[PDB]
Design an enzyme around this catalytic site. Structure first.
Site, PDB file in Angstrom:
ATOM      1  CG  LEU B  43       5.333   4.281  13.776  1.00  0.00           C
ATOM      2  CD1 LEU B  43       6.742   4.557  13.227  1.00  0.00           C
ATOM      3  CD2 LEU B  43       4.514   5.240  13.220  1.00  0.00           C
ATOM      4  CE  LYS B  47       4.494 -14.940  14.769  1.00  0.00           C
ATOM      5  NZ  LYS B  47       4.444 -16.521  14.382  1.00  0.00           N
ATOM      6  CE1 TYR B  48      11.367 -14.142  18.595  1.00  0.00           C
ATOM      7  CE2 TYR B  48      12.015 -13.845  16.380  1.00  0.00           C
ATOM      8  CZ  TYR B  48      11.766 -14.838  17.419  1.00  0.00           C
ATOM      9  OH  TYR B  48      11.791 -15.695  17.068  1.00  0.00           O
ATOM     10  CD  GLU B  50       4.550  -3.253  21.762  1.00  0.00           C
ATOM     11  OE1 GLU B  50       4.169  -2.364  21.877  1.00  0.00           O
ATOM     12  OE2 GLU B  50       4.694  -4.042  22.355  1.00  0.00           O
ATOM     13  CG  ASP B 154      11.250 -11.702   7.712  1.00  0.00           C
ATOM     14  OD1 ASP B 154      10.571 -12.364   6.898  1.00  0.00           O
ATOM     15  OD2 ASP B 154      11.019 -11.158   8.766  1.00  0.00           O
TER      16      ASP B 154
HETATM   17  C1  LIG Z   1       3.333  -5.865  -2.720  1.00  0.00           C
HETATM   18  C2  LIG Z   1       4.816  -5.861  -2.476  1.00  0.00           C
HETATM   19  C3  LIG Z   1       5.434  -4.856  -3.395  1.00  0.00           C
HETATM   20  C4  LIG Z   1       5.857  -5.483  -4.630  1.00  0.00           C
HETATM   21  C5  LIG Z   1       6.596  -4.450  -5.593  1.00  0.00           C
HETATM   22  C6  LIG Z   1       6.720  -3.302  -5.211  1.00  0.00           C
HETATM   23  C7  LIG Z   1       6.332  -2.890  -4.124  1.00  0.00           C
HETATM   24  C8  LIG Z   1       5.775  -3.598  -3.239  1.00  0.00           C
HETATM   25  C9  LIG Z   1       5.647  -3.072  -1.762  1.00  0.00           C
HETATM   26  C10 LIG Z   1       3.934  -2.469  -1.403  1.00  0.00           C
HETATM   27  C11 LIG Z   1       3.818  -1.925  -0.424  1.00  0.00           C
HETATM   28  C12 LIG Z   1       4.764  -1.790   0.623  1.00  0.00           C
HETATM   29  C13 LIG Z   1       4.496  -1.025   1.875  1.00  0.00           C
HETATM   30  N1  LIG Z   1       5.149  -1.721   3.075  1.00  0.00           N
HETATM   31  C14 LIG Z   1       4.550  -0.949   4.269  1.00  0.00           C
HETATM   32  C15 LIG Z   1       5.553  -1.583   5.250  1.00  0.00           C
HETATM   33  C16 LIG Z   1       5.492  -1.116   6.579  1.00  0.00           C
HETATM   34  N2  LIG Z   1       6.048  -1.694   7.565  1.00  0.00           N
HETATM   35  C17 LIG Z   1       5.837  -0.981   8.869  1.00  0.00           C
HETATM   36  C18 LIG Z   1       6.038  -1.151  10.284  1.00  0.00           C
HETATM   37  O1  LIG Z   1       6.939  -2.164  10.616  1.00  0.00           O
HETATM   38  C19 LIG Z   1       7.177  -2.480  11.809  1.00  0.00           C
HETATM   39  C20 LIG Z   1       5.618  -0.124  10.819  1.00  0.00           C
HETATM   40  C21 LIG Z   1       4.902   0.973  10.647  1.00  0.00           C
HETATM   41  C22 LIG Z   1       4.433   0.982   9.145  1.00  0.00           C
HETATM   42  C23 LIG Z   1       4.939   0.213   8.243  1.00  0.00           C
HETATM   43  N3  LIG Z   1       4.887   0.030   6.970  1.00  0.00           N
HETATM   44  C24 LIG Z   1       5.978  -2.256   0.376  1.00  0.00           C
HETATM   45  C25 LIG Z   1       6.257  -3.130  -0.844  1.00  0.00           C
HETATM   46 CL1  LIG Z   1       7.718  -3.664  -0.895  1.00  0.00          CL
END
Ligand SMILES: CCc1ccccc1-c1ccc(CNCCc2nc3c(OC)cccc3[nH]2)cc1Cl
Ligand SMILES: CCc1ccccc1-c1ccc(CNCCc2nc3c(OC)cccc3[nH]2)cc1Cl
Lengths: 324, 326
Positions: B43, B47-48, B50, B154
């Protein structure tokens, strides 16, 4: 065995999306128990301890039930049921779901209920009081039944009353279940004295009508001043105590109607019993709580055949309640 | 030296709890058998770590499996203890299992499944309501973890997963999270550059939960102004200059004087002199539909140099910007 379905609210869950009755899929958000300070222990269940507590954020008294984690799906079921019924008439109000940071023990937080002593009311209770509180329990039952849920643990211990404010709450939804037509349920529910004949003969396709039997056991104990009314010493003996009142002829008609197989444990203890008149239970101590209306209402609750018992809505229209 | 500081909220929550709660180095981890899980697809990364989508073969339910690159042993212990402490908290990724593959012996964490919406092409669809809604959801997660004595450290878009169809949000990757102890001096090499608080950039170690509120303010500014990232530093020193081009240099000096912070000589030739900008300067045709006086007042109250002057997560939750949310 012959299948059976509820006479009322049969399809209330069938016509609702999975999220309502699918408690195994429900996601529980456990807040921080730091917001509550425990004051004293109030009561206890086989898998819970009930405390009086204070919410430190608004200085309001609450009730905190700490769950002994025996089954995970069981905690999820009680929470979902409580969330579905939250705010319903005479239903205990779930206010929060918390865990202590170190113990991580599941804890449920409810609206405060100020319990009036059960033994203090018992002798000072009037015919009116019994009808009044019977109607209040019926409001709770018709409501949870309409919401597609059976309490399955209706008994005096699960009814909290604040006689000063004439306030009643039906509590401990830990054995409650969602009714689905044709579903086979575990018969190991309710407390011995309140178990319906359906549970004792291991007839699994039961429904909301189980709660109406338990309600009938409660009314009988109150109007006759005989507690419990059906005093079994074990689950098998419990059916014999019922049979000593309702008779064995109607018990066989019941098991034949549903093609139920009687456990061999009943063979040497059941015997042969005549059907008793409810008037035989009237004595000088209790005659002021008994009336033809009360006996007719009781007769219509305490029936072997779960289908022949009054529903909570039919019970609410009985002449016994014309004065409430 | 520098003036000491402590959190305005939840100051002593760990001080009043036994060793057991916050002493992660002493916590004993029970690693189960990873044979109950079949990995499906990758997905993302860290850095540490998967992160994979997986299937639990025992109940046919999807899960998320995070495989940790064993860089530091105390670090794995810290993340696991924090995840166990927060397990079940509102909008917190739910740790379901802790496993090790029999042959690899690599640490792996198993979580509740989260169904990520492609944030791409849907930022344009987002409404003023959606921002308020999701900001409130993140605040629920933060007030909860801070109440539990944990700083996430973070907070950024990558660490917020959203299932837009079910309006479900989870704050993930607790690998940099720490237990807050008043007066403790922390490592400032935390958070991700664009989201680092001024306290980290000026090497002020006695920081607290308020660091997460700065990171939240960076996220809010980027969403409402459609400017990603809002403070675009090219290195950690340049990051403070990017902040100073908005908040101005007068308030930066008041901040460093209040805490008697020694500014690194690396700032001497790059900081310059900057006026304090009006937040209205960032409003343009592309984003005006997400901006309001309430949003700008709320943003102004998060993006403050002084970590003590920023709204706490509980104060943020009571702001008029959230009067329209559930
Ligand atoms: C721009 C920031 C923001 C401000 C206010 C309201 C919403 C957002 C926002 C907008 C979009 C997202 C979507 N974040 C996806 C995060 C994510 N992390 C992942 C991941 O981490 C290992 C693996 C696979 C899919 C992943 N998807 C999150 C957020 Cl918090
Ligand atoms: C006139 C009412 C009535 C009519 C018919 C049959 C019985 C009664 C009755 C008689 C007494 C009670 C009181 N039961 C209190 C039970 C109770 N359960 C508790 C408890 O459970 C966790 C904790 C603390 C206090 C608790 N108190 C309830 C009831 Cl419903």
């Amino acid at each position: 065995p012959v299948p059976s379905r509820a006479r009322v609210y049969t399809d209330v869950n069938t016509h609702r999306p999975s999220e309502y009755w699918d408690y195994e899929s429900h996601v529980v958000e456990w807040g921080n128990q730091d917001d509550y300070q425990l004051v004293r222990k109030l009561g206890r269940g086989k898998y819970s301890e009930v405390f009086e507590a204070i919410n430190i954020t608004n200085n309001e008294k609450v009730v905190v039930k700490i769950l002994k984690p025996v089954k995970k799906k069981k905690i999820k079921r009680e929470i979902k049921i409580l969330e579905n019924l939250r705010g319903g008439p005479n239903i205990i109000t779930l206010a929060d779901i918390v865990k202590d940071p170190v113990s991580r023990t599941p804890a449920l937080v409810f609206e405060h209920v100020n319990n009036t002593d059960f033994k203090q009311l018992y002798q000072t209770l009037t015919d009116y009081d019994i009808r009044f509180y019977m109607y209040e329990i019926l409001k709770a039952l018709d409501y949870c039944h309409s919401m597609g849920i059976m309490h399955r643990d209706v008994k005096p211990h699960n009814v909290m009353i604040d006689h000063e404010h004439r306030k009643l709450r039906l509590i401990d939804w830990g054995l409650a279940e969602f009714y689905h037509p044709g579903q086979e349920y575990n018969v190991r529910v309710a407390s011995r004295y309140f178990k319906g004949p359906e549970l004792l003969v291991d007839y699994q396709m039961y429904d909301y009508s189980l709660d109406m039997w338990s309600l009938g056991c409660m009314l009988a104990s109150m109007i006759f001043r005989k507690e419990p009314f059906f005093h079994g010493h074990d689950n098998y003996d419990q059916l014999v105590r019922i049979a000593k009142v309702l008779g064995t002829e109607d018990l066989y008609d019941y098991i034949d109607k549903y093609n139920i197989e009687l456990d061999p444990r009943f063979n040497d203890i059941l015997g042969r019993h005549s059907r008793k008149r409810w008037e035989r239970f009237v004595h000088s101590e209790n005659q002021h709580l008994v009336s033809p209306e009360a006996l007719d209402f009781l007769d219509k609750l305490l029936r072997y055949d779960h289908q022949s018992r009054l529903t909570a809505r039919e019970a609410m229209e009985h002449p016994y309640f014309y004065t409430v």
